């Protein structure tokens, strides 16, 4: 219902297709926050396990 750009279009087409199921992903505001902490000279990164 918010900042998941590739998830909310999927949810809209799923509702029109009669399938009440979502496929959530990462928030674009969290990507914005990661880019800003990286721009502050601090290496933050998601860890693939």
């Amino acid at each position: 219902k918010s900042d998941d750009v590739n998830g909310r279009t999927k949810m809209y087409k799923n509702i029109v297709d009669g399938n009440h199921q979502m496929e959530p992903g990462m928030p674009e505001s969290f990507n914005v926050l990661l880019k800003e902490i990286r721009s502050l000279g601090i290496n933050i990164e998601l860890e693939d396990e």
Binding site: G18, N19, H20, Q21
Partner: protein, 75 residues
């Protein structure tokens, strides 16, 4: 089961596991292309799943052995 969910809750034991089992059953009834075990009486699949849990035909192990049985039929 339209107003309250207390009979289904005393059937299962936990509202969170109730939500998960009834969501699995409502997925199978909505997009899985299945048919209910209770008369639907013009209800949504959510309330049909909750009425099935209240009557006592749908449980977690019931759904699991039903999925395993239909898996052995399709294989």
């Amino acid at each position: 089961a339209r107003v309250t969910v207390q009979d289904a809750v005393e059937k299962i034991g936990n509202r969170f596991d109730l939500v998960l089992v009834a969501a699995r059953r409502a997925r199978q009834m909505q997009v899985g292309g299945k048919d209910p075990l209770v008369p639907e009486e013009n209800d949504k699949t959510t309330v049909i799943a909750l009425r099935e849990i209240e009557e006592g035909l749908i449980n977690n192990q019931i759904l699991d052995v039903r999925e395993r049985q239909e898996q052995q039929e399709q294989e």
